[PDB]
Amino acid sequence: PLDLALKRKYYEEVRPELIRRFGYQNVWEVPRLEKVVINQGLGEAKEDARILEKAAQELALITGQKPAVTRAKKSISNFKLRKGMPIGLRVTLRRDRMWIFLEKLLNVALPRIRDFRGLNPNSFDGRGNYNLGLREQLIFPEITYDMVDALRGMDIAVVTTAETDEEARALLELLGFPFRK
């Protein structure tokens, strides 16, 4: 699936506008979206793996990719964890995996979130990366209503060939990223 409406937003609309705000010398400098790594840190369903399956496969509906699990290291006795029973649903997508999901996102996921003024532009950590969290995950296209038995939320992750986040603030937005400013 090497063709979709948001794939060329970058190609034939965001790329040349990125050379305008900075002006580079080499085509392989223009900040490049190319690595989304979603995760679900649910220590909640730690005890039973039953809810765990329903959360991952449900996660597969939005990610559109085979999901995997992260095991824990130390021992949080205080919320009751030891070896590696703990669960975080991780699924890294590149190529056009991300381009099909981020299309459901900025055009169908974000807007349908309960009162969404805009993203939180403080989430730029310094490097050309960015992060955000959510609650209701049913703000997604495929997820229906008679399928959700709990509003377990998540928090995503985005990478770019961007050194300074001032370049990131210009790349994400141009691809249709709604911030609070």
Binding site: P1, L4, A5, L61, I62, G64, I100, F101, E103, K104, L106, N107, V108, L110, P111, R112, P141, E142
Partner: peptide
């Protein structure tokens, strides 16, 4: 399969994921 997003506010989007029957409610165009 090329899905079909039919939200209340026109804006019928076509992307890629399971079951092209995505009745969205007030998407990005509203």
């Amino acid at each position: 399969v090329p899905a079909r997003i039919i939200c209340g506010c026109g804006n019928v989007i076509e992307t890629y994921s399971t079951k092209p029957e995505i009745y969205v409610e007030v998407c990005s165009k509203c």
